[PDB]
RNA sequence: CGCUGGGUAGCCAAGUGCGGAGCGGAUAACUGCUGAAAGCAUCUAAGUAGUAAGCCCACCCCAAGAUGAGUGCUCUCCUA
RNA sequence: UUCACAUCGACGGGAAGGUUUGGCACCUCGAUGUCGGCUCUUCGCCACCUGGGGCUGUAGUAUGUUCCAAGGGUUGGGCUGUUCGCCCAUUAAAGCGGUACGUGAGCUGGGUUCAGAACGUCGUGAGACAGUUCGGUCCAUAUCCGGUGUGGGCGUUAGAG
RNA sequence: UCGGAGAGAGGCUCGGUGAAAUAGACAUGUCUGUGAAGAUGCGGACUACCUGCACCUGGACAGAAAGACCCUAUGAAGCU
RNA sequence: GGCCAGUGAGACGAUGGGGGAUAAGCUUCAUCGUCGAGAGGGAAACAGCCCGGAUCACCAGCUAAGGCCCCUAAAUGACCGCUCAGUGAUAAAGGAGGUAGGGGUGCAGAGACAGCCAGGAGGUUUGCCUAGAAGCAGCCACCCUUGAAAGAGUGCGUAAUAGCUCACUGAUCGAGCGCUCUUGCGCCGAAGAUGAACGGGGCUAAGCGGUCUGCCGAAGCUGUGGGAUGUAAAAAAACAUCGGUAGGGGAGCGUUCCGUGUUAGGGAGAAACGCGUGCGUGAGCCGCGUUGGACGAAGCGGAAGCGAGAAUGUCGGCUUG
RNA sequence: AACCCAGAGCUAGCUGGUUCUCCCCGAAAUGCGUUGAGGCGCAGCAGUUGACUGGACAUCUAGGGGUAAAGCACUGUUUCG
RNA sequence: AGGGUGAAAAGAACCCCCAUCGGGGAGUGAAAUAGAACAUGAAACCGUAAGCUCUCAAGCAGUGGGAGGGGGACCAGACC
């Protein structure tokens, strides 16, 4: 035989989810245009 | 008739839960009854018909049903 | 699915028929308390299968309840105790109105199968249910007649289902097969049949032709 | 998602957020999933103004 | 059972009967039939034939708590 | 006899398995009881036989080797505590292993060779030997799972046979 | 071989009397995988109505009892 | 420096090595990351692998790792190619007209490949051996001629011959045919003992490679509000911080007794025991009791036989079986 | 090498256990030495109180090397003419 | 190892059950639920009554959401 089985934390460096597609690493979050600031949350009315 | 099995099973599942209704709560039975006629003529793709096994087993060993 | 209608009769002891060639054969003697009247036929139209329903042991009306005797008087026949059907292929010509069928249909057919309640032996051990062996009777042994090992070691952690334990042995019906018929009696209402039927003299006994 | 998918034409939950942030609606906070069942004509007005 | 001699009914075998059937279905290895991708060929890529104590069914029994809780026949619900 | 590939295959190489002896010391020593036998399983195929086939330096019988196939079987004994093994009579064949000896909360002998004694050898001696021989207590009412039987309740949308 | 029958005392049922070892709480399945590398308790699947009685003991690394074997202690003791 | 602790059994992963058999979740070192002492998300489950550092609340939003058929949140999304083995979890040497390409080199409209048919002869049985060896048991070279081409022969066969047949050429139809390297994904090699056992169902895409847009996705970040620590030495306000084992420091609650105390209060119900739609960061306080019947608060202080879930603890009571 | 009492609450580098709350900080499993290896003393790394200090993190420059790579100029070793 | 009915035995006259033990009325007492096992009586433990709910169900028995139902209610939206 002479093939070692990959045990714990060697199983984790092999069988962890790795996204090995060079496209899907390039993705940043989407950017919307900036909006004007929202008004005050409330106002004193006397 | 001439519908493939697993995608039909998923689109029957998405109505059998109730995930096409806005009243979907996953703790109650908001689903819908479905009826599937012509189960004898369900299509499959590839080599499911001669290579996919619905094996079962009782508790005792040596009872795995081919 | 059976290959034809059968009858039912009671066991009345055993004896030996002397064949005129010189042989001595052990036969069981079958009596007939009452004729096996076809009570209810169930065809492919009004039922999912086809079977002919006969009965046996004409009795007193006090012995029989209202649904039983109402079912039997739906056919216009005598009130009788036992009641069994034979499933038969759809070529049948059987009226449920009092067909007192005579026992001539088995003599030329020199092969018959029989079913019956074997005699019960109660809660018996593994030494007679499943034909085990006993341990050493001597040499310092202690597991006389006991059940021995039950399972494997740690890796199952349980015992397999259907494992041969002691339990109630007899009481269920059995069918012994292809039993060759012998001298019927057209006046003694008695059929010789060479073999050994299940049970002591007195019990019900299915007597139906073979299924080979 | 189950409320938007009742249109029949292929409009997913992702496209409702496509044209929910492009048409500038700051942060309805998924309480349109509450008035999506308490006020289904009002969420039909929400979505039918997301289309235009 | 004082020790022996036999024995009916039970129980049992060493005794007595019976069973292991199927030109039934599909296959594994193999032999093929036409037969192309390379006008030759090849059991195969289309279709298809023989065939295993193996698989399933048939065989004997239990069996609708099979909560999917079946089907058929029949009886009974009255007085204020 | 010619002929690498009917059958063996030197010099070398590549694997699978975890059944031997090993390596590590990762669970267990406020206790995981080793070896053999009896009883009783069940499973694997790396096939001894049975069923089908290919090739044969297969004339036929019998083969040699190999493919599919684990349904079923795989004897009785003399020696030894024996596993293994030798031998006799055979048989279609008398397969190899896993399941913590598979199985000592089911059972008994050699042993982790316990306490007595003797022989050889070692030691000045007390004593000791992975040397030998005789004798040498082995517990247990099943709580739960698991199993084999056998009920009772309730359900099966009226209640039953 | 190769078991078989019968008689007692138990075992089973009823009436009386009535413990014990053990015990974190137990609403206490099987396979397979993972995990302190042998899981009813974690994961996936399958299977199981609830709850008794009588037997059997494969597991709960079952009960005992701070392993007699192995090693450590600048431990104890006997003996030479 | 002063006072004062633990720790000195480590583990895995990457790199650099030694021991081994470049075998071990093996052993010993050197730098680093995590666990130890680290919660959450992805990894089916699963200390050490990736993201990530948990003060607390919200029935808030945006994201990292990773995913978007169903179980289970988000795309049965779009456009190029590939795989037909359920490969998609797996291990090699080696084999292969598998399929999708790519680079070389050789033949063709003066007919290129595959099949049928025709020829394949003369010296010659080259010279040795053998009975024969005539190409076919073998040894040595292994010719030229007619020609369209023929090799002392490619194999079978025969006692040897004879003979069947091929490399090569001629002829009919006709337009692609070889033989090498090479990747991508595949096939076989590839077989275990209880039972699908590879998350499941399943899918020819829901698989594998290349891009494009969005969404889901943590206790991360942001937002809105509290608490505490450090600045800091009063308050307010500000900025930073606030996971934690062994351990260190600061601040507090409770208990019984004592000083005030022959305290206030109390047979118009004290302590106890039981109760809460109350308050605190919590240890706890306060309040209510058709129970009970005589003691005893708070505040400001002190002293402990001072706080219980563990010791095969121990003493009583009562279970299980 | 009896039992009881007493020294004796012998001794144990060993085992188990050591009880209320909140806040801040926060390791180590390394070296040396040891009749020592599962103990201990010191150093390393915590907590708190200070006294001197002006550094950390990025970038650049300068110094010694002899590792990786490489090479046969020394020491060996080796294939062929 | 085993203390504490009351302030005072004033310790239950008499009637019934009845062989006793004990129990219920009546009487003493401020209290008889202070009755001689007698003072406050907690937890484990054993029970009985009322409300909701479990017999296709896999679960360190919780927690977040909460179907259905029940109870008093007054900030009737709240609480259990």
CSV table of N, CA and C (backbone and C1' of nucleotides) in Angstrom, one decimal, chain H residues 249-299:
chain,number,residue,atom,x,y,z
H,249,G,P,-3.8,40.3,44.5
H,249,G,O5',-4.4,41.7,44.0
H,249,G,C5',-3.5,42.8,44.0
H,249,G,C4',-4.1,43.9,43.2
H,249,G,C3',-5.4,44.5,43.7
H,249,G,O3',-5.3,45.4,44.8
H,249,G,C1',-5.6,44.1,41.4
H,250,G,P,-6.5,45.5,45.9
H,250,G,O5',-7.6,46.3,45.2
H,250,G,C5',-7.3,47.7,44.8
H,250,G,C4',-8.5,48.2,44.0
H,250,G,C3',-9.8,48.3,44.6
H,250,G,O3',-10.0,49.4,45.5
H,250,G,C1',-10.1,47.3,42.5
H,251,A,P,-10.8,49.1,46.9
H,251,A,O5',-12.3,49.0,46.5
H,251,A,C5',-13.0,50.1,45.9
H,251,A,C4',-14.2,49.7,45.1
H,251,A,C3',-15.4,49.2,46.0
H,251,A,O3',-16.1,50.3,46.5
H,251,A,C1',-15.1,47.7,44.3
H,252,G,P,-16.9,50.2,47.9
H,252,G,O5',-18.2,49.4,47.5
H,252,G,C5',-18.9,48.5,48.4
H,252,G,C4',-19.8,47.5,47.6
H,252,G,C3',-20.6,46.6,48.5
H,252,G,O3',-21.8,47.2,49.0
H,252,G,C1',-19.6,45.4,46.8
H,253,C,P,-22.3,46.7,50.4
H,253,C,O5',-23.2,45.4,50.1
H,253,C,C5',-24.2,45.5,49.2
H,253,C,C4',-24.8,44.1,48.9
H,253,C,C3',-25.2,43.3,50.1
H,253,C,O3',-26.4,43.6,50.7
H,253,C,C1',-23.9,41.9,48.7
H,254,G,P,-26.6,43.6,52.3
H,254,G,O5',-26.6,42.1,52.7
H,254,G,C5',-27.6,41.2,52.2
H,254,G,C4',-27.3,39.8,52.4
H,254,G,C3',-27.0,39.3,53.8
H,254,G,O3',-28.2,39.1,54.6
H,254,G,C1',-25.3,38.5,52.4
H,255,U,P,-28.3,39.6,56.1
H,255,U,O5',-27.9,38.4,57.0
H,255,U,C5',-28.3,37.1,56.6
H,255,U,C4',-27.3,36.0,57.1
H,255,U,C3',-27.0,36.1,58.6
H,255,U,O3',-27.9,35.5,59.4
H,255,U,C1',-25.0,35.9,57.3
H,256,U,P,-28.8,36.3,60.4
H,256,U,O5',-28.1,36.2,61.8
H,256,U,C5',-28.1,35.0,62.5
H,256,U,C4',-26.8,34.9,63.4
H,256,U,C3',-26.6,36.0,64.4
H,256,U,O3',-27.4,35.8,65.6
H,256,U,C1',-24.6,35.5,63.3
H,257,C,P,-27.9,37.1,66.4
H,257,C,O5',-26.6,37.6,67.2
H,257,C,C5',-26.0,36.8,68.2
H,257,C,C4',-24.6,37.4,68.5
H,257,C,C3',-24.5,38.8,68.9
H,257,C,O3',-24.8,39.0,70.3
H,257,C,C1',-22.8,38.4,67.3
H,258,C,P,-25.5,40.3,70.8
H,258,C,O5',-24.4,41.4,70.8
H,258,C,C5',-23.2,41.3,71.7
H,258,C,C4',-22.1,42.2,71.3
H,258,C,C3',-22.4,43.7,71.4
H,258,C,O3',-22.4,44.2,72.7
H,258,C,C1',-21.3,43.2,69.4
H,259,G,P,-23.4,45.4,73.1
H,259,G,O5',-22.8,46.7,72.4
H,259,G,C5',-21.6,47.2,72.8
H,259,G,C4',-21.3,48.6,72.2
H,259,G,C3',-22.5,49.5,72.1
H,259,G,O3',-22.8,50.2,73.3
H,259,G,C1',-21.3,49.5,70.1
H,260,U,P,-24.3,50.4,73.9
H,260,U,O5',-24.9,51.4,72.9
H,260,U,C5',-24.5,52.8,72.9
H,260,U,C4',-24.9,53.5,71.6
H,260,U,C3',-26.4,53.6,71.4
H,260,U,O3',-27.1,54.5,72.2
H,260,U,C1',-25.3,53.1,69.4
H,261,G,P,-28.6,54.4,72.5
H,261,G,O5',-28.9,52.8,72.6
H,261,G,C5',-28.8,52.2,73.9
H,261,G,C4',-29.4,50.8,73.8
H,261,G,C3',-28.3,49.7,74.0
H,261,G,O3',-28.9,48.5,74.6
H,261,G,C1',-29.3,49.5,71.8
H,262,U,P,-28.8,48.3,76.1
H,262,U,O5',-30.3,48.0,76.6
H,262,U,C5',-31.2,47.1,75.8
H,262,U,C4',-32.6,47.7,75.7
H,262,U,C3',-32.8,49.1,75.3
H,262,U,O3',-33.9,49.2,74.5
H,262,U,C1',-33.8,48.8,77.4
H,263,U,P,-33.9,49.1,72.9
H,263,U,O5',-32.8,50.3,72.5
H,263,U,C5',-33.2,51.6,72.6
H,263,U,C4',-33.2,52.3,71.2
H,263,U,C3',-34.5,52.2,70.5
H,263,U,O3',-35.5,53.2,70.9
H,263,U,C1',-32.7,51.7,69.0
H,264,A,P,-37.0,52.8,70.9
H,264,A,O5',-37.4,53.0,69.4
H,264,A,C5',-37.4,54.2,68.7
H,264,A,C4',-37.6,54.1,67.2
H,264,A,C3',-38.9,53.3,66.8
H,264,A,O3',-40.0,54.1,66.9
H,264,A,C1',-37.1,52.5,65.6
H,265,G,P,-41.3,53.6,67.7
H,265,G,O5',-41.7,52.3,67.0
H,265,G,C5',-42.2,52.3,65.6
H,265,G,C4',-42.1,50.9,65.0
H,265,G,C3',-43.0,49.8,65.6
H,265,G,O3',-44.3,49.9,65.2
H,265,G,C1',-40.8,49.0,65.3
H,266,G,P,-45.5,49.4,66.2
H,266,G,O5',-45.3,47.9,66.5
H,266,G,C5',-45.6,46.9,65.5
H,266,G,C4',-45.3,45.5,65.9
H,266,G,C3',-45.9,45.1,67.2
H,266,G,O3',-47.3,44.7,67.1
H,266,G,C1',-43.7,44.5,67.3
H,267,G,P,-48.3,44.9,68.3
H,267,G,O5',-49.3,43.6,68.2
H,267,G,C5',-48.8,42.4,68.7
H,267,G,C4',-49.9,41.4,68.8
H,267,G,C3',-51.0,41.7,69.9
H,267,G,O3',-52.3,41.4,69.4
H,267,G,C1',-50.1,39.5,70.2
H,268,A,P,-53.4,42.5,69.4
H,268,A,O5',-53.1,43.3,68.0
H,268,A,C5',-53.1,42.7,66.8
H,268,A,C4',-53.2,43.7,65.6
H,268,A,C3',-51.8,44.4,65.3
H,268,A,O3',-51.8,44.7,63.9
H,268,A,C1',-53.4,46.0,66.0
H,269,G,P,-51.2,43.6,62.8
H,269,G,O5',-50.1,42.8,63.7
H,269,G,C5',-48.7,43.2,63.6
H,269,G,C4',-47.8,42.1,64.0
H,269,G,C3',-47.5,41.1,62.9
H,269,G,O3',-46.1,40.6,63.0
H,269,G,C1',-48.5,40.0,64.7
H,270,A,P,-45.0,41.0,61.9
H,270,A,O5',-43.7,40.9,62.7
H,270,A,C5',-42.9,42.1,63.1
H,270,A,C4',-41.6,41.7,63.8
H,270,A,C3',-40.8,40.6,63.1
H,270,A,O3',-40.0,41.0,62.1
H,270,A,C1',-41.2,40.1,65.4
H,271,A,P,-39.8,40.2,60.8
H,271,A,O5',-38.9,38.9,61.2
H,271,A,C5',-37.6,39.1,61.7
H,271,A,C4',-37.1,37.9,62.4
H,271,A,C3',-37.1,36.6,61.5
H,271,A,O3',-36.1,36.5,60.6
H,271,A,C1',-38.0,36.1,63.6
H,272,A,P,-36.4,36.1,59.1
H,272,A,O5',-37.0,34.7,59.2
H,272,A,C5',-36.2,33.5,59.5
H,272,A,C4',-37.1,32.4,59.9
H,272,A,C3',-37.7,31.5,58.9
H,272,A,O3',-36.8,30.6,58.3
H,272,A,C1',-39.3,32.0,60.6
H,273,C,P,-36.6,30.6,56.7
H,273,C,O5',-38.0,29.9,56.1
H,273,C,C5',-38.3,28.6,56.4
H,273,C,C4',-39.8,28.3,56.0
H,273,C,C3',-40.2,28.8,54.6
H,273,C,O3',-39.9,27.8,53.6
H,273,C,C1',-41.7,29.6,56.2
H,274,G,P,-39.5,28.2,52.1
H,274,G,O5',-40.9,28.8,51.6
H,274,G,C5',-42.0,28.0,51.2
H,274,G,C4',-43.3,28.8,51.1
H,274,G,C3',-43.4,29.5,49.8
H,274,G,O3',-43.8,28.7,48.7
H,274,G,C1',-44.0,30.9,51.6
H,275,C,P,-43.6,29.2,47.2
H,275,C,O5',-44.7,30.3,46.9
H,275,C,C5',-44.5,31.4,46.1
H,275,C,C4',-45.3,32.6,46.6
H,275,C,C3',-45.2,33.8,45.7
H,275,C,O3',-46.0,33.7,44.5
H,275,C,C1',-45.0,34.5,47.9
H,276,G,P,-45.3,33.3,43.1
H,276,G,O5',-45.5,34.6,42.2
H,276,G,C5',-44.6,35.7,42.3
H,276,G,C4',-45.3,37.0,42.7
H,276,G,C3',-45.1,38.1,41.7
H,276,G,O3',-46.3,39.0,41.9
H,276,G,C1',-44.0,38.7,43.8
H,277,U,P,-46.9,39.7,40.6
H,277,U,O5',-45.6,39.7,39.6
H,277,U,C5',-45.8,39.5,38.2
H,277,U,C4',-45.5,40.7,37.3
H,277,U,C3',-45.2,42.0,38.1
H,277,U,O3',-44.3,42.8,37.5
H,277,U,C1',-47.1,42.3,36.7
H,278,G,P,-42.8,43.0,38.1
H,278,G,O5',-43.0,44.1,39.2
H,278,G,C5',-43.2,45.4,38.9
H,278,G,C4',-42.4,46.3,39.8
H,278,G,C3',-40.9,46.5,39.6
H,278,G,O3',-40.6,47.5,38.6
H,278,G,C1',-41.2,46.0,41.8
H,279,C,P,-39.3,47.4,37.6
H,279,C,O5',-38.1,47.7,38.6
H,279,C,C5',-38.0,49.0,39.2
H,279,C,C4',-37.0,49.0,40.3
H,279,C,C3',-35.5,48.7,39.9
H,279,C,O3',-34.9,49.9,39.4
H,279,C,C1',-36.1,47.5,41.8
H,280,G,P,-33.8,49.8,38.3
H,280,G,O5',-32.5,49.3,39.0
H,280,G,C5',-31.5,48.5,38.4
H,280,G,C4',-30.5,48.0,39.4
H,280,G,C3',-29.5,46.9,38.9
H,280,G,O3',-28.5,47.4,38.1
H,280,G,C1',-30.4,46.2,41.0
H,281,U,P,-28.6,47.4,36.5
H,281,U,O5',-27.5,46.3,36.0
H,281,U,C5',-27.7,45.0,35.7
H,281,U,C4',-26.5,44.1,36.0
H,281,U,C3',-26.5,43.5,37.4
H,281,U,O3',-27.1,42.2,37.5
H,281,U,C1',-24.4,44.5,36.9
H,282,G,P,-28.7,42.1,37.9
H,282,G,O5',-28.7,40.7,38.7
H,282,G,C5',-27.9,39.6,38.3
H,282,G,C4',-26.8,39.3,39.3
H,282,G,C3',-27.2,39.2,40.7
H,282,G,O3',-27.7,37.9,41.0
H,282,G,C1',-25.3,40.6,40.5
H,283,A,P,-28.6,37.7,42.3
H,283,A,O5',-27.7,37.5,43.5
H,283,A,C5',-26.7,36.4,43.7
H,283,A,C4',-25.6,36.8,44.6
H,283,A,C3',-26.0,37.1,46.0
H,283,A,O3',-26.2,36.0,46.8
H,283,A,C1',-24.5,38.8,45.2
H,284,G,P,-27.5,35.9,47.7
H,284,G,O5',-27.6,37.3,48.4
H,284,G,C5',-28.8,37.8,48.9
H,284,G,C4',-28.9,39.3,48.7
H,284,G,C3',-30.1,40.0,49.1
H,284,G,O3',-30.2,40.2,50.5
H,284,G,C1',-29.5,40.8,47.0
H,285,C,P,-31.7,40.2,51.3
H,285,C,O5',-32.2,41.7,51.0
H,285,C,C5',-31.6,42.8,51.5
H,285,C,C4',-32.1,44.1,50.8
H,285,C,C3',-33.5,44.5,51.1
H,285,C,O3',-33.7,45.2,52.3
H,285,C,C1',-33.1,44.6,48.8
H,286,C,P,-35.0,44.9,53.2
H,286,C,O5',-36.2,45.5,52.4
H,286,C,C5',-36.3,46.9,52.3
H,286,C,C4',-37.4,47.2,51.2
H,286,C,C3',-38.8,46.7,51.6
H,286,C,O3',-39.5,47.5,52.5
H,286,C,C1',-38.3,46.1,49.4
H,287,G,P,-40.6,46.8,53.5
H,287,G,O5',-41.8,46.4,52.6
H,287,G,C5',-42.7,47.3,52.0
H,287,G,C4',-43.5,46.7,50.9
H,287,G,C3',-44.5,45.6,51.4
H,287,G,O3',-45.7,46.1,52.0
H,287,G,C1',-43.3,44.8,49.5
H,288,C,P,-46.4,45.4,53.2
H,288,C,O5',-47.2,44.1,52.4
H,288,C,C5',-48.1,44.4,51.4
H,288,C,C4',-48.6,43.1,50.8
H,288,C,C3',-49.2,42.0,51.7
H,288,C,O3',-50.5,42.3,52.1
H,288,C,C1',-47.6,41.0,50.2
H,289,G,P,-51.1,41.7,53.5
H,289,G,O5',-51.4,40.2,53.1
H,289,G,C5',-51.5,39.2,54.1
H,289,G,C4',-51.3,37.8,53.6
H,289,G,C3',-51.1,36.7,54.6
H,289,G,O3',-52.3,36.3,55.2
H,289,G,C1',-49.4,36.5,53.0
H,290,U,P,-52.5,36.6,56.8
H,290,U,O5',-53.5,35.5,57.3
H,290,U,C5',-54.9,35.5,56.9
H,290,U,C4',-55.7,34.4,57.5
H,290,U,C3',-55.2,33.0,57.1
H,290,U,O3',-55.4,32.1,58.1
H,290,U,C1',-57.4,33.3,56.3
H,291,U,P,-54.3,31.8,59.2
H,291,U,O5',-53.1,31.2,58.4
H,291,U,C5',-53.0,29.8,58.0
H,291,U,C4',-51.7,29.2,58.3
H,291,U,C3',-51.1,29.5,59.7
H,291,U,O3',-51.6,28.6,60.7
H,291,U,C1',-49.4,29.8,58.0
H,292,G,P,-51.9,29.1,62.2
H,292,G,O5',-50.4,29.5,62.8
H,292,G,C5',-49.5,28.4,63.1
H,292,G,C4',-48.1,29.0,63.3
H,292,G,C3',-47.9,29.9,64.5
H,292,G,O3',-47.6,29.2,65.7
H,292,G,C1',-47.0,30.8,62.5
H,293,G,P,-48.6,29.2,66.9
H,293,G,O5',-47.9,30.1,68.0
H,293,G,C5',-46.5,29.9,68.3
H,293,G,C4',-45.7,31.2,68.3
H,293,G,C3',-45.9,32.0,69.6
H,293,G,O3',-44.7,32.7,69.9
H,293,G,C1',-46.6,33.2,67.7
H,294,A,P,-44.2,32.6,71.5
H,294,A,O5',-43.2,33.9,71.6
H,294,A,C5',-41.8,33.8,71.6
H,294,A,C4',-41.1,35.1,71.3
H,294,A,C3',-41.1,36.1,72.5
H,294,A,O3',-40.0,36.9,72.4
H,294,A,C1',-42.2,37.0,70.6
H,295,C,P,-38.6,36.5,73.2
H,295,C,O5',-37.5,37.3,72.3
H,295,C,C5',-36.9,36.7,71.2
H,295,C,C4',-37.5,37.3,69.9
H,295,C,C3',-36.6,38.2,69.1
H,295,C,O3',-35.8,37.4,68.2
H,295,C,C1',-38.7,39.3,69.3
H,296,G,P,-34.3,37.9,67.9
H,296,G,O5',-34.4,39.3,67.2
H,296,G,C5',-34.9,39.5,65.9
H,296,G,C4',-35.2,40.9,65.5
H,296,G,C3',-34.0,41.9,65.6
H,296,G,O3',-33.3,41.8,64.4
H,296,G,C1',-35.8,42.8,66.8
H,297,A,P,-31.7,42.0,64.4
H,297,A,O5',-31.4,43.2,63.3
H,297,A,C5',-32.1,44.4,63.4
H,297,A,C4',-33.0,44.7,62.3
H,297,A,C3',-32.4,45.7,61.2
H,297,A,O3',-31.6,45.0,60.3
H,297,A,C1',-34.5,46.4,61.9
H,298,A,P,-30.1,45.5,60.0
H,298,A,O5',-30.3,46.9,59.3
H,298,A,C5',-31.0,47.0,58.0
H,298,A,C4',-31.4,48.4,57.7
H,298,A,C3',-30.3,49.5,57.6
H,298,A,O3',-29.7,49.5,56.3
H,298,A,C1',-32.0,50.3,59.0
H,299,G,P,-28.1,49.5,56.2
H,299,G,O5',-27.7,51.0,56.7
H,299,G,C5',-28.1,52.2,56.0
H,299,G,C4',-27.9,53.4,56.8
H,299,G,C3',-26.5,53.6,57.3
H,299,G,O3',-25.6,54.2,56.4
H,299,G,C1',-28.0,53.9,59.1
